Design a binder for this molecule. Structure first.
Ligand SMILES: Nc1ncnc2c1ncn2[C@@H]1O[C@H](COP(=O)(O)OP(=O)(O)OP(=O)(O)O)[C@@H](O)[C@H]1O
Ligand SMILES: Nc1ncnc2c1ncn2[C@@H]1O[C@H](COP(=O)(O)OP(=O)(O)O)[C@@H](O)[C@H]1O
Ligand SMILES: [Mg+2]
Lengths: 440, 896
């Protein structure tokens, strides 16, 4: 049943294809890592953790919900199945009807869907059933295969993630972008040298030398422990060969949907005032990237805030704190530079410049009692602490934060009805796809 | 052979590098000497071309010796290396290597100084001793160092003199513009910091206002060099006054400090023993180093807020050795902003016009050329590159950035280890959202810092430029100009070629510059400039809209050129109607200042008839000879139009336009000095073909070839575009060229008939035959016949205006053919015969592309509207009118 679901996913998108060998390797990993139910549960956890990284966010939610539905429909009774199906239908706007009350998580999902919190309703299945997730590092560290393919849409790149992974693994990457015959020859020689000697190698934009990919890469993957290969392709680009894709581990790189999750990621990726400014910049970057995806209401277009803007803003903050040692930090200067130069260079519409200026004024106001979100307050550092103490205090005040269900409106300071429409449309798409998938 | 003898046949200890090439050169020299002796008493060119292959590595090593040779062609490199005793060959390529130097001043086997493009003379500190033993690269390197030291010395002298307390009005007459500019900027930032230490700004504001007024007064009585220098210092001093006034109006100290931090500050180190690294430029907390490279007196830009924010983001990108990226619509100030940033940083920014022909090898060779020099490279129109090349060169660009950031001495690109100068940087100015342009990959976009300049500040530019021109009322006039442009953009028909942005305002100002001598610096001048710039590009109703809004917002002889046009048209047989003369006026006025022109109208509307006669009349008026190179753009291939890189030996082959530009630049025979050169592109305006000339058409006036060659555009070299529709053309190639829209045909039906007639007669008693043919013609019935011909069904729809040709040639050829039997018949019979011949010509020219029933209807209507009657089968035999049935021969085919 799971293999049929994954085959349907591969029917939807060429990158989502599934090979029986990969599924059987996952089944073997289930044993490498009331009994038969336990093996079935471990199988579900492993297949989710392995093949979720090869799907984007909407397909992640679709597959998580359909696996939860399959497991819980086989395990629980028919009334449970009817209640879950009615909740999916009212999420899909196909069958409007209250569920039959029995357990405990059922009322949690009912409260999530009655309060029109569609994102929480979609992620409830992930939060309830599955208890593990994998990033690129986990995929690389838990794969017998030495060939990897990473896919993302246009105007986003995960090369910096691979560079960070190689730095953390004490390896060497030879970034060889594709598109010209000289790069192809260099890639051939580097592949031979890295097979004989070792070291990682990344080919960039492999959808742009498709003939070479179809002949040389196909024959090479067809036929040293410290040798790994990475290839980056676009989800909206031209179709890659199926035999090449099925022989490589597939990863979809995409920005973290959460706000607090993005704050924690940017915080873990990194005197006291430098740490404070880094915390404020990470919060600002997470907030602006969360607001960016709201195309018509949060902004006026689709923008792309990435690690380069964070690096440039952090360097500017460090330089400002370095050349202004009199503790009279020019917060207005920082606000203007971050809103106009670093994060405002991409902004083309003046009203989006105004909203990013408002965000910078809210974040970098330079107040002792700053309330960046309705729940968490960030007090300014004292003059008797240390860098490690400030790091620990900011991490602790980050850990106590609990992201609410209505955090796409309250945290971004937006009208509630636009968020209602966006979440409703996304949940309708996800639930309609899941309904069309489950009946067959 | 002279180049070969210079490189190898004359210099000693230079033939020991390549012994096989040495033997080949010796054999070629012996053969050439034998041929010359035989001549004085094909195969050689083939042998020379064969031995050019062994010279490629030698030329590459020579370019490695002096990195500025990368901007020169192989033939130019041969010329510069070979001429080791003449020493005047090197002065010809100063603009190609440096950019702001046109020649070298030589005095008795020594180098006294260099001269800028505009004519400024820079005197070197120490005269360079030149001997026959030394070769080009060593003294060129020491000349570059001497130029940098001379710029620093004049800067220091001017700064010390200004610190002594004297006014700038006596100092501007002593040193070059760059020295005065940098010293004035250092003084301004020092004095503004002193004022910001206190809270008083009115005193220095009044002092700066008095300085500006004194400069404006001194401009009226100065020479051209001094006038240009005073204009540029006035731009800088207006920026100074704007910043000081903005600081004075500030409410509190913190916002004043923020405003001062947002603007460029020109400090100077007072402890460094290195002279060339003593000046650093500060903005937004970052610091960048002045290079003291010669700039000359460029066309300085007005310091708009957008310009300052662009400077800030360029500094932000370059602080981490990242690339600077500018994107937005056409004519918004991206390339000029990059060039102004370079000029403020004391170096000439080398701009490259990207193209589909720039493959990975070409772009990487340009990258190693600019990294070895240390020059600032601007890659104009980065979207025009193929996406595969964009992905491929990402590794090279990232390697350049990493080497700059980590201070690596060498970087390896194109399979060679070359030095990496720390002064280099890369800039790109792309135009997203346009058809025919690729999209940059994100791995390449993360290597550049992009900034948006969708909307510039036209009002400030217009106000400051008009004030500099010497206009009594500048603020109100600039506001009126910008408001008129906005109403013209809003209240006109929304068809694609109407663009009223910054480029047309700049054209209006440039056209208003030269007629103030006889119209005066007032409102008549600006309204006349607005007419001369905008009216040719407007239609019929939009012309009335232009007149209405011009009268609403603006309350307020050329006899010789009209006579020249009339004489040229009389020679060419054209008719000077109101529309034709109006179009010729518009073309002449808009070509007087704009160098690239587009002619758009219906097919056969009269574009060629317009520009040909205007060119002839200008040749009459000025006395200058004219050369025209009419090229059909889409007939040729892009590689056949600009040039192709031969992959067999990595050598360059010129195209057609490149060949013409090189032929006019070389000036071998000296007959192109005092001539106007026209290159007409009489085909469709393909973005791929034309946008490769973006740097050619704008104020850069340079042709950036793939192999690094930089051919300048002479001021008398003008480009004409002849087409019908601008459907696929981008606004990038529309705003750069003055557009002459043809709303209707410039010729009446009878005037075109007469022109075709007398052209045919000139192509051939004869006067009597011409008079009788014209008497047979009757315009009163001809117009009705032409009007009735429009109701017929025509395949391959051709306008009746275009069918007069075929009728005229048929009639004239019939009369010429039958002229043999035209001396033995009465006048009435001759008139009837010519009438029948002209009637059948009109039939087969107007309804000849229609069905048989339509042809019968048309012969009926031409009989009713005319005279000997012509039937469907009427004919003339040898001269009696008859039918077809008496002409059919008996045919009895055999079996086989
Ligand atoms: N002022 C004029 N007086 C007489 N005849 C004229 C005049 N202007 C144009 N014509 C006639 O118009 C005809 C077509 O004009 P012209 O040769 O300028 O076409 P064009 O603009 O180059 O058109 P296309 O784009 O179709 O090639 C000419 O052959 C000429 O006989
Ligand atoms: N302060 C200014 N900023 C921008 N452009 C200016 C300014 N002053 C004058 N100009 C003129 O406006 C024109 C704008 O061209 P530009 O937009 O730089 O070309 P591109 O479209 O290739 O970037 C230039 O020709 C320049 O001469
Ligand atoms: Mg440009």
């Amino acid at each position: 049943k799971i293999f049929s679901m994954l085959e349907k996913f591969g029917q939807f998108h060429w990158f989502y294809g599934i090979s029986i060998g990969q599924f059987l390797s996952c089944f073997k990993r289930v044993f490498i890592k009331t009994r038969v139910d336990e093996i079935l549960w471990l199988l579900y956890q492993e297949v989710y953790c392995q093949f979720s990284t090869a799907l984007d966010k909407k397909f992640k939610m679709i597959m998580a919900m359909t696996m939860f539905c399959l497991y819980k429909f086989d395990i629980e009774s028919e009334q449970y199945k009817e209640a879950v199906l009615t909740m999916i239908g009212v999420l899909s706007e196909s069958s409007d009807g209250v569920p039959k009350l029995t357990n405990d998580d059922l009322r949690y999902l009912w409260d999530y869907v009655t309060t029109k919190s569609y994102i929480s309703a979609l992620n409830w299945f992930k939060n309830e059933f599955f208890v593990d997730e994998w990033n690129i590092a986990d995929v690389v560290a838990n794969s017998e295969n030495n060939y990897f393919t990473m896919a993302s849409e246009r105007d986003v790149d995960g090369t910096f993630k691979l560079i960070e992974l190689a730095k953390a693994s004490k390896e060497s990457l030879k970034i060889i972008p594709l598109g010209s015959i000289e790069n192809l020859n260099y890639a051939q020689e580097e592949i031979s040298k890295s097979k004989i000697e070792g070291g990682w190698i990344l080919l960039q934009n492999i959808q742009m030398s498709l003939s070479w990919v179809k002949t040389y890469l196909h024959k090479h993957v067809e036929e040293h422990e410290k040798f790994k290969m990475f290839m980056t392709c676009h989800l909206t680009g031209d179709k890659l060969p199926a035999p090449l894709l099925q022989r490589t581990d597939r990863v979809v790189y995409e920005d973290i949907p959460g706000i607090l999750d993005t704050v924690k990621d940017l915080w873990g990726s990194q005197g006291v005032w430098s740490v404070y400014c880094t915390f404020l910049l990470s919060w600002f970057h997470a907030l602006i990237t969360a607001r960016t995806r709201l195309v018509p209401h949060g902004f006026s277009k689709k923008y792309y805030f990435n690690d380069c803007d964070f690096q440039f803003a952090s360097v500017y903050l460090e330089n400002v704190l370095a050349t202004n040692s009199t503790n009279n930090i020019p917060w207005a200067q920082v606000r203007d530079h971050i809103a106009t130069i670093v994060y405002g260079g991409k902004i083309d519409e003046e009203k989006d410049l105004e909203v990013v200026a408002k965000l910078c004024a809210h974040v970098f106001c330079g107040s002792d009692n700053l309330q960046i979100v309705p729940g968490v307050r960030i007090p300014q550092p004292l003059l008797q602490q240390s860098e490690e103490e400030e790091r620990a205090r900011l991490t602790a005040i980050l850990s106590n934060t609990i992201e609410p269900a209505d955090s796409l409106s309250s945290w971004l300071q937006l009208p509630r009805e636009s968020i209602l429409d966006y979440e409703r449309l996304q949940a309708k798409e996800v639930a309609s796809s899941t309904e069309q998938l489950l009946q067959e | 052979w002279l180049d070969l003898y210079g490189i190898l046949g004359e210099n000693l200890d230079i033939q020991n590098f390549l012994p096989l090439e040495t033997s080949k050169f010796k054999s070629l020299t012996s053969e050439y000497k034998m041929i010359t002796t035989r001549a004085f008493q094909k195969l050689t060119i083939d042998s020379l071309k064969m031995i050019k292959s062994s010279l490629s590595t030698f030329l590459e090593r020579q370019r490695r010796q002096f990195p500025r040779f990368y901007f020169l062609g192989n033939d130019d490199l041969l010329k510069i290396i070979g001429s080791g005793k003449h020493h005047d060959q090197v002065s010809k390529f100063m603009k190609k290597m440096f950019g702001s130097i046109e020649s070298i001043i030589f005095f008795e086997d020594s180098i006294t100084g260099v001269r800028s493009v505009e004519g400024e003379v820079l005197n070197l500190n120490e005269k360079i001793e030149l001997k026959d033993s030394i070769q080009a690269q060593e003294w060129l390197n020491i000349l570059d160092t001497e130029i940098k030291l001379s710029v620093f010395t004049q800067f220091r002298d001017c700064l010390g003199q200004l610190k002594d307390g004297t006014d700038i009005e006596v100092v501007v007459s002593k040193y070059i513009f760059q020295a005065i500019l940098l010293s004035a900027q250092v003084m301004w930032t020092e004095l503004v910091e002193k004022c910001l230490q206190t809270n008083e700004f009115s005193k220095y504001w009044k002092e700066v206002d008095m300085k500006i007024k004194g400069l404006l007064d001194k401009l009226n009585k100065s020479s051209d060099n001094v006038k240009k220098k005073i204009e540029a210092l006035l731009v800088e001093y207006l920026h100074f006054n704007n910043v000081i006034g903005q600081l004075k109006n500030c409410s509190t100290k913190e916002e004043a400090r923020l405003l001062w931090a947002k603007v460029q500050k020109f400090y100077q180190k007072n402890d460094t023993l290195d002279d060339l690294n003593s000046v650093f430029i500060s903005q937004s907390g970052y610091l960048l180093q002045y290079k003291f490279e010669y700039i000359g007196i460029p066309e300085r830009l007005i310091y708009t807020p957008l310009l300052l924010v662009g400077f800030a983001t360029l500094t932000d990108s370059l602080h981490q050795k990242y690339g600077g990226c500018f994107f937005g619509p056409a004519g918004t100030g991206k390339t000029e902003t990059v060039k102004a940033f370079g000029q403020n940083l004391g170096r000439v920014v080398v701009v490259f016009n990207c193209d589909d022909s720039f493959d990975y090898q070409v772009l990487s060779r340009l990258l190693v050329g600019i990294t070895q020099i240390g020059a600032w490279g601007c890659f104009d129109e980065f979207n025009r590159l193929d996406e595969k090349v964009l992905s491929a060169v990402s590794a090279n660009i990232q390697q350049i950035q990493n080497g700059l950031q980590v201070g690596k001495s060498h970087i390896t690109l194109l399979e060679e280890e070359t030095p990496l100068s720390p002064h280099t940087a890369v800039f790109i100015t792309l135009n997203p959202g346009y058809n025919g342009r690729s999209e940059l990959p994100e791995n390449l976009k993360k290597s550049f810092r992009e900034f948006s300049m969708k909307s510039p500040q036209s009002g400030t530019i217009a106000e400051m430029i008009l004030q500099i021109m010497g206009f009594e009322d500048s603020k109100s006039l600039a506001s009126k100009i910008v408001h008129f442009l906005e109403l013209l953009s809003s209240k006109c028909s929304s068809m694609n070629h109407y663009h009223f942005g910054l480029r047309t305002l700049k054209g209006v100002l440039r056209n208003c510059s030269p007629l103030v001598s006889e119209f005066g610096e007032g409102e008549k001048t600006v309204v006349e400039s607005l007419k001369r710039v905008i009216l040719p590009s407007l239609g019929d109703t939009d012309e009335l809209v232009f007149k209405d809004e011009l009268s609403k917002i603006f309350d307020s002889n050329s006899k010789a050129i009209v006579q020249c046009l009339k004489d040229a048209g009389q020679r060419s047989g054209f008719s000077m109607s109101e529309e034709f003369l109006k179009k010729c006026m518009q073309f002449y006025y808009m070509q007087k200042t704009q160098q690239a022109l587009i002619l758009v109208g219906k097919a056969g509307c009269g574009k060629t008839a317009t520009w040909k006669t205007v060119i002839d009349a200008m040749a009459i008026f000025d006395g200058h000879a004219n050369v025209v190179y009419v090229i059909d753009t889409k007939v040729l291939t892009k590689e056949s139009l600009y040039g192709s890189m031969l992959k067999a030996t990595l050598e360059w082959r010129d195209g057609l336009f490149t060949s013409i530009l090189r032929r006019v630049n070389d000036d071998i025979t000296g007959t192109f000095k005092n001539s106007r050169i026209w290159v007409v592109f009489d085909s469709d305006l393909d973005p791929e073909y034309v946008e490769a000339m973006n740097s050619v058409l704008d104020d850069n006036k340079i042709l950036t070839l793939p192999n690094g060659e930089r051919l300048p555009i002479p001021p008398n070299f003008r480009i004409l575009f002849e087409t019908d529709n601008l459907d696929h053309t981008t606004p990038a190639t529309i705003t750069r060229c003055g557009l002459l829209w043809f709303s209707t045909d410039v010729c009446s039906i009878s005037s075109k008939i007469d022109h075709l007639l007398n052209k045919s007669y000139e192509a051939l008693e004869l006067d009597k035959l011409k008079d009788l043919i014209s008497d047979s013609f009757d315009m009163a019935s001809l117009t009705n016949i032409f009007t009735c011909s429009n109701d017929l069904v025509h395949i391959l729809g051709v306008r009746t205006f275009n069918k007069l040709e075929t009728a005229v040639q048929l009639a004239v050829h019939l009369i010429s053919s039958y002229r043999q039997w035209f001396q033995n018949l009465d006048d009435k019979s001759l008139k009837d015969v010519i009438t029948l011949l002209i009637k059948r010509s009109l039939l087969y020219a107007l309804a000849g592309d229609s069905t048989g029933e339509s042809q019968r209807a048309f012969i009926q209507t031409i009989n009713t509207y005319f005279s000997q009657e012509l039937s469907d089968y009427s004919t003339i035999v040898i001269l009696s009118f008859s039918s077809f049935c008496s002409e059919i021969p008996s045919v009895s085919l055999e079996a086989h």
